[PDB]
Write a protein that binds this DNA or RNA. Structure first.
Length: 125
RNA sequence: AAACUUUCAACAACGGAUCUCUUGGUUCUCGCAUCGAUGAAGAACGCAGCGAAAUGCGAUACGUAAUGUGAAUUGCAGAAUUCCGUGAAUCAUCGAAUCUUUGAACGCACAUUGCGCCCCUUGGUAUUCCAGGGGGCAUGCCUGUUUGAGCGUCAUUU
């Protein structure tokens, strides 16, 4: 249970904050968990997902589907992964969204900021 | 006997009740003290690559600067190695600015995008005219400055 008075357990307020979060907060909201191998390697349970992360689906109709992220649609609260698509009847391939909470991060796109955030959260590369 | 009319069921018909939902209300509580002549609240007109609104903004116009974050924005399309970075973003923060015409609204007017006046600059062989760029000219009151007025009144005058 909550103890502090600045935390609100009101469903209406929490839902409004989620649905009207700006993109900076949606980045944290769209965090994805690392695989078991990456969790062992880094020491990080989960990270905010990025554009070039290699990701594996662990839940849904595309379980066990690998693929590098193609976009982080923060407006739609989703991520778009290459080769995870739907072939329309006209033949066009459209992206299929899915939540990063249903994914596992299998390869990190590392830059200076990602590595610094890993050390911040307690990782060691 | 049919058609027609009534009743019931099935399916199909505008209707949008019911059910479930809910970024909205409404009450209660706690904390705080912050509008404006340094131009407010409000109004008008404009600003997006493709748009007119309680979106945001002002000719620096869906915004500039500074800061934080750290890779987006996204309906479509795009300047660009913008991606191990003084750096994406309809991001957050926000202390620097810009802030059109107005509005208590301030040169005089205002059912007019109407008329002046004063400085400095530029152009027209120009201190006077015209034009352009910039900066100004409200009222009441206070303190001070300067210039005054009044046999209201003080120190010199046959």
């Amino acid at each position: 249970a909550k103890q502090s008075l600045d935390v609100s357990s009101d469903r209406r307020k929490a839902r409004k904050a989620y649905f009207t979060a700006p993109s900076s907060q949606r980045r944290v909201l769209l965090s994805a968990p690392l695989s078991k191998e990456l969790r062992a390697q880094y020491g990080i349970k989960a990270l905010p997902i990025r554009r070039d992360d290699e990701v594996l689906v662990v839940r849904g109709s595309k379980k066990g589907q690998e693929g590098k992220i193609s976009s982080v649609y923060r407006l739609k609260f989703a991520v778009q992964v290459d080769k995870v698509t739907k072939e329309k009847v006209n033949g066009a391939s459209v992206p299929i969204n899915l939540h990063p909470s249903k994914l596992v991060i299998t390869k990190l796109h590392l830059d200076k900021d990602r590595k610094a955030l890993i050390q911040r959260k307690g990782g060691k590369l």
